[PDB]
Design a protein around this ligand. Structure first.
Ligand SMILES: N#Cc1ccc(C(=O)N[C@H]2C[C@@H]2c2ccccc2)cc1
Ligand SMILES: N#Cc1ccc(C(=O)N[C@H]2C[C@@H]2c2ccccc2)cc1
Lengths: 314, 314
């Protein structure tokens, strides 16, 4: 995928903040929302496929990333603020609605969009990220003690720490992260007592089967502008996000919905989604075998097929 | 229009040539192409109305203007090059077809788009500018010599001359130009003899009833970036344009088409369009009474009515 061959759009959603996106195709608007720590470019395989399938694709740089604004303040990346900005995005583009498709943190965003702004969301799809109604009893910090696979999230809390490690060597960062599950050089059991995320992983990791050197270098260039502060801030609003989700928990998602699970995502595990039909009875599903966290990159053909089928039906 | 309330798009059509556009709405793509010496902003009254009517509007800064590239070479602004660029624009955006609507020089462009690239043009509409097939006998230079109302065109030929006069005082330039026909302060009949287009006209023109100070100052700010060289270059390719037009070999335009005439446009007079049905069988027509050259600004309600009716039927 060549960026200069793409149409680049820019929408100021408030004085300090503009969102960049890439746009391809004609037809119903489909807004793609990437996760951490990614880019509009993580959708490179879906963009032309969806456009060819008859859709107008808007692939975002989410707030904090690429050519979009990345203010430093933690509170600029709470879900409530992020969602209101996506609604302003649609307004300024003159879109009454769009289909929203998200992955990872972008998947959490699209569920909140469907929940609090159903009038603006035609249909909702998430890759890897389940939708669980807020639990009125437990805080999100309490859920890390119950579920220890999210211990790296505690490491991500302290401003400056994860940033310094992830920005030290961008090429090594992206090569370490973007790998098939069987190629993985990272463990999520205890990270901050271990000293850091990369402490015991190769200084010059090999290039994963999933990615070329050229694709890795694109991410490198992108993260040179703002680095990891904005992206990491997405993790630093757990209590605010929890309190906002609580303001909804009575109401239901009534729009068409798709939950796509990845067999080998060891952080956002397929089973984390098991009882979603209890609160979304009309929920459709996709499941991808031999697929790690980096779904769109790991199994693009399978992602394309699942999304196009669902888009063309419900 | 508030420009910062708009989505701004950018497409690289050649390594060093970028086209800027404003985008609003969902539905079939409608590409608006302004004239001399104007802006995407000349479509300000049409953009929201067309979007509200169910269309996805892409209002261009044409090559040489605003935030689009403005290379200095005369040859970069021949109709053949400008048209091929607009096809590349469509390619990069992933648009198989768009409706093209032009005014003035943008009107000439959309006629050539419909003529040489009908497969990319869903339907074509021109404000003021007729389509008359190239005459293989008479040169464009000989035709300017016949009708004395195009003397300003000769004055526009030598590079540097008209630029220095139009750039001298941008505010006076736009206030002198953008006026209703009954308000006009300019000698279009004879310009080159006098030594100036504004030589006789008021040093401090009043504000036409058509425009506010705020609107005039927008054009002033746009023309600060690249000035008048690019815009004037559109006029400096008469022989090349004629040679390209002859390559059509008397082929017809077979797609849906609309010709809108303006009663009080004294440069692009309604009679200049009178025999157009002979080379465009199906041609539909609109006509606006009490309308001077600056059609979109002069009679925006009538323009909107005419265009929406035509779009919805054809
Ligand atoms: N709701 C929700 C939600 C969304 C996203 C994540 C998340 O953390 N994603 C993982 C892949 C990224 C990661 C982890 C560790 C190092 C580098 C990247 C956790 C919870
Ligand atoms: N085909 C064709 C074609 C297109 C455009 C024109 C043209 O000249 N437009 C006029 C309005 C602009 C103008 C003229 C003089 C001073 C300032 C602006 C003439 C022929």
């Amino acid at each position: 995928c060549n960026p200069s061959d793409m149409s680049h759009g820019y929408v100021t959603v408030k004085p300090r903040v503009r969102l960049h996106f890439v746009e391809l195709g004609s037809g119903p608007a489909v807004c793609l929302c990437h996760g951490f720590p990614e880019s509009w470019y993580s959708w490179r395989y879906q963009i032309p496929a969806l456009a060819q399938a008859g859709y107008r694709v808007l692939a975002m740089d989410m707030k904090g990333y690429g050519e979009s604004s990345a203010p430093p303040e933690i509170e600029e990346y709470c879900m409530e603020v992020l969602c209101k900005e996506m609604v302003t995005f649609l307004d300024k583009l003159g879109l009454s609605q769009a289909v929203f498709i998200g992955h990872d943190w972008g998947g959490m965003l699209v569920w909140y969009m469907a929940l609090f702004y159903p009038e603006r969301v035609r249909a909702v799809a998430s890759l890897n990220t389940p939708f669980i109604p807020a639990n009125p009893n437990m805080s999100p910090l309490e859920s890390i003690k119950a579920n220890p696979v999210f211990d790296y999230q505690l490491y991500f809390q302290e401003p400056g720490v994860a940033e310094a490690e992830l920005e030290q060597n961008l090429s090594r960062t992206f090569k370490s992260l973007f790998r098939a599950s069987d190629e993985s050089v990272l463990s999520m059991h205890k990270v901050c007592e271990a000293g850091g995320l990369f402490v015991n992983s190769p200084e010059e990791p090999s290039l994963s089967r999933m990615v070329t050197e050229e694709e890795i270098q694109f991410y490198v260039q992108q993260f040179k502008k703002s680095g990891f502060r904005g992206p990491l801030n997405w993790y630093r609003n757990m209590e605010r996000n929890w309190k906002w989700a609580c303001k909804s928990l009575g109401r239901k998602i009534l729009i068409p919905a798709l939950m796509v699970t990845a067999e080998k995502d060891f952080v956002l595990v397929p089973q984390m989604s098991q009882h979603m039909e209890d609160w979304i009875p009309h929920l459709k599903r996709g499941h991808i075998e031999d697929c790690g966290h980096w779904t769109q990159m790991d199994k693009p053909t399978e992602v394309n097929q699942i999304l196009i089928k669902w888009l063309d039906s419900d």
